[PDB]
Amino acid sequence: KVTTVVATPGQGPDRPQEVSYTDTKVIGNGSFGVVYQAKLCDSGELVAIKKVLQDKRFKNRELQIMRKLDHCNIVRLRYFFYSSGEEVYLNLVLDYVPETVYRVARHYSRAKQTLPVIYVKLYMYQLFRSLAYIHSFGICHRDIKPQNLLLDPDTAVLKLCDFGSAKQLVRGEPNVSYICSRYYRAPELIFGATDYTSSIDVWSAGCVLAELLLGQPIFPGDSGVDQLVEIIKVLGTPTREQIREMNPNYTEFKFPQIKAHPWTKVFRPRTPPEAIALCSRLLEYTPTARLTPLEACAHSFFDELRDPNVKLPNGRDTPALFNFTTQELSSNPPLATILIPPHARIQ
Amino acid sequence: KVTTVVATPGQGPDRPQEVSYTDTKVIGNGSFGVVYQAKLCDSGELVAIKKVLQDFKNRELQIMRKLDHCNIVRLRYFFYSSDEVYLNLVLDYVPETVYRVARHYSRAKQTLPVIYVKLYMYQLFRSLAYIHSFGICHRDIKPQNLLLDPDTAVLKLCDFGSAKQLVRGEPNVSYICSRYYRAPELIFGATDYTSSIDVWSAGCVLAELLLGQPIFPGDSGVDQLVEIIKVLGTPTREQIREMNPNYTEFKFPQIKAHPWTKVFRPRTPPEAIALCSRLLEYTPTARLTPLEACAHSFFDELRDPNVKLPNGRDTPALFNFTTQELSSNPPLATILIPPHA
Ligand SMILES: O=C(Nc1cc(-c2ccc3ccncc3c2)ccn1)C1CC1
Ligand SMILES: O=C(Nc1cc(-c2ccc3ccncc3c2)ccn1)C1CC1
């Protein structure tokens, strides 16, 4: 069954093209709708088609955001088009990526092994770079989690996906507190704050890092109260001040009174001290105290990636990690001093 | 081998007794601590010992010492043990949970027989009627917290670690209650909610037993809300206002309500569907009270003098209401207590 549509390219000027695809199969369901895998007739390349009901009232926010993004660590929007399906549907045609951090982490966990630190470095670095890029537009993802981190195992390339929760945050304009997924929610979201910032993504990324190092989620729980107890067990009880910077009116509630557990005793003995240091600077109560994504990229944990001699275990080169644009560096241009190693500067 | 402690009876005055037990095994871990199973030397009876770090006074203990009801797990004893100090709550052990039983049916591609849906939900609503009459809200109603004896079909409500006596005008944390079972006012982060959040959670359990899977799934509040809206339709401004003000002016999926009949399988009893629709209401004050739910027609079969369990035994005691239990609406007694009781 060959399907043919006239679709609009994700990037560049509006110049629709005939696109034919076949071998359609479902690779995902959700509240949003359905994600299909398909094969393009022209090139044989695989795509993922995210199909969602289209609101008659306004432009789709996810589409508007994805048409603005162009970055090697963000899943590319190849085309989009509208169609029927019983009401009108928006179809987002994305590059298909063969793996996710969720699935890879599960494979190691079930095999009683941990992902090699070199991959933890590579994946988390690319995640932080994707965040530096979107944040520089004021855009917050709001649902960072392993299932939304696509991986190409052969090239070790990570790509951020699912911009269905993403939003341009504006200071003084309220946002829904109920975004972000179980295990990965910043404490200010748990406290129901509506005035949060892009640093909620940095907390979520910190949970992903911790999880890759531990082999399991660092703050599990099916309720916010369970998640908060797990957080308090590590960070200790938050001060009245720390509570004020997460959500006022949570000032006077009764919290568990636990002393902070030393970060080193959280992870296995073999865990590199730089990884632990990095976790502690991401997983901070006070949102403005967390590292920015660009500062995270510059962290000592990623020094190995900047070594001119670094290679993948496959033998392959690492992906391009150093070609930062002015846009990517804009939150703190002199960080390029660290971010771009001497060998990446040879003319 | 054998552990001997000096434990305080859960009810009655503080007169500690020597209590010995054996065969201790772990039956659960959580954010709170650990739950052990043990066997009492005196009676051979099985108990669950919940062990939590002790701080101020323990709210869960204070609440449980006040409760005495056949559909709430009994606090037999409590005791302290050890460089910190732990509170140990000694509970009656119950062999099964609704979580585990629903899973067994789901995995077998079968539905739990409606007679058990009636029995279990009725007893849950009785337990809620009882605790709500003290002003106490459980705040974590879910299948894992619903213990079952499969031989007698008795259900007992458990885990009061989130429970609180709600006081009008005094804020409460919004972040209680578990994924799938949270009332929309909680998802919206409300701090001024009422005991009707337990009724929403109960409605989700009822729908799940009928469907064979949770009715409002999703790992984020936004996904859960979408699933809710797909069934109830988009909430109105007023309905939002009754859930949480300032969540007005937010953009919501503009979806029309789904006919409750088409939510469930064709086999589903219409009274089950009617009851569901009266529990899962956006406006918290529009939801049925637990006592009203007990009196709903869906449970009429339980009030039949000829009703029996599928294993051949009589049903457990369903009609032994106290004044306290009926206090939200005493005239319901004429429905709740049938002529043959
Ligand atoms: O799922 C895979 N690859 C993949 C998934 C997607 C993909 C999957 C689920 C989504 C849900 C919501 N929004 C976007 C989504 C994109 C996109 C590209 N490649 C492979 C592991 C099978
Ligand atoms: O778990 C079972 N029975 C059981 C569990 C409990 C039980 C289990 C977990 C809890 C967690 C928090 N608070 C109270 C809890 C009580 C109590 C009595 N009986 C049977 C399925 C094995």
- Assess contact for A239 and A232: CB atoms under 8 A: no
- Specify which residues B81 forms β-bridges with: B86
Top-level class of domain A18-98? alpha beta
3-class secondary structure, A256? coil
Closest CA to B18 of B7, B9, B26: B7
Rounded to whole angstroms, the Cα distance separating A327 from A83 reads: 35
Closest ligand 2 atom to Cα of B92: 18
Resolution reached, in Å?
A: 2.0
Give the DSSP per-residue string, A9-75: ESSSS---EEEEEEEEEEEEE-SSEEEEEEEETTT--EEEEEEEEPPSSS--HHHHHHTT---TTB-
A99-317 shares the fold of A18-98: no
Phi, psi (deg, nearest 5) at residue B35: -110, 125
- Assess contact for A91 and A50: CB atoms under 8 A: yes
Closest CA to A280 of A296, A269, A294, A268: A296
Rounded to whole angstroms, the Cα distance separating B100 from B150 reads: 11
Q: Could you confirm whether domain B18-95 is CATH 3.30.200.20?
A: yes
The binding site of A for ATP consists of 27-35, 50
Run of H or E including A277 = helix A273-282
- How many C-beta atoms surround the C-beta of residue A106 within 10 A? 12
Secondary-structure percent of chain A, ordered helix, strand, coil, rounded to 5: 35, 20, 45
Fold of A99-317: Transferase(Phosphotransferase); domain 1 (1.10.510)
- Assess contact for A127 and A114: CB atoms under 8 A: no
Nearest to B225 among A58, A178, A226 (CB): A178
User: Which chain B residues are Cβ-neighbours of A217 within 8 angstroms?
Assistant: none
Breaks (C-N over 2.5 A) in chain B follow: 55, 82
First-to-last alpha carbon distance for chain B, in angstroms, is 46
Give the DSSP per-residue string, B144-162: GGEEEETTTTEEEE---SS
- Assess contact for B203 and B211: CB atoms under 8 A: no
Rounded to whole angstroms, the Cα distance separating A80 from A6 reads: 9
- Ligand 1 pocket, Cβ-based, cut-off 6 angstroms: A 27-28, 30, 32, 35, 48, 50, 75, 94, 96-100, 103, 150, 161-162, 164
Cα distances from B2 to residues A96, A212, B37, in angstroms, run: 60, 41, 13
* Residue with token string 């009683």: A112
Ligand (nearest to CA of B148): 2
User: A157-160 and A149-152 as β-strands: parallel, antiparallel, unpaired?
Assistant: antiparallel
- Assess contact for A286 and A245: CB atoms under 8 A: yes
Instruction: Extract the tokens encoding A223.
Output: 């309720």
Q: CB-based contacts of A258: which residues, under 8 Å, 6+ apart?
A: A232, A233, A236, A237
Cα distances from A2 to residues A11, A18, A35, A94, A115, in angstroms, run: 25, 13, 18, 18, 40
- The verdict on B226 touching A (C-beta cutoff 8 Å) is yes
User: Which chain A residues are Cβ-neighbours of B175 within 8 angstroms?
Assistant: 190-192, 223-225, 227-228
3-class secondary structure, A74? strand
- The verdict on B33 touching A (C-beta cutoff 8 Å) is no
Q: CB-based contacts of A125: which residues, under 8 Å, 6+ apart?
A: A297, A302, A305, A321
**What does the domain layout of chain A look like in residue ranges?**
18-98, 99-317
3-class secondary structure, B125? helix
Q: Could you confirm whether domain B96-341 is CATH 3.20.20.70?
A: no
- The verdict on B29 touching A (C-beta cutoff 8 Å) is no
User: A149-152 and B164-165 as β-strands: parallel, antiparallel, unpaired?
Assistant: unpaired
Find the closest chain B residue to A182 by CA distance: B219
Ligand (nearest to CA of B47): 2
Find the closest chain A residue to B223 by CA distance: A31
Rounded to whole angstroms, the Cα distance separating A34 from B221 reads: 19
CB contact under 8 A, B174 and A165: no
* Experimental technique behind these coordinates: X-ray
What's the burial of A284, exposed, middle or buried (CB within 10 Å: 0-12/13-18/19+)?
Answer: buried
User: How many angstroms from the chain centroid is the CA of residue B286?
Assistant: 20
CB contact under 8 A, B220 and A254: no
Closest CA to B52 of B89, B24, B23, B20: B89
3-class secondary structure, A80? strand
Nearest to A223 among B177, B188, B224 (CB): B177
Instruction: Please count the residues of chain A.
Output: 347
User: Which chain B residues are Cβ-neighbours of A253 within 8 angstroms?
Assistant: 171, 173
3-class secondary structure, B38? strand
Identify the active-site residue in A55, A95, A143, A222. Answer: A143
Catalytic positions of B, please?
140
- Assess contact for B285 and B232: CB atoms under 8 A: no
CB contact under 8 A, B56 and A250: no
Rounded to whole angstroms, the Cα distance separating B74 from B200 reads: 25
The binding site of B for ATP consists of 27-35, 50
- Specify which residues A33 forms β-bridges with: A52
Q: Which amino acid is at B272?
A: A
Instruction: Extract the tokens encoding A199.
Output: 């640093």
- Assess contact for A336 and A325: CB atoms under 8 A: no
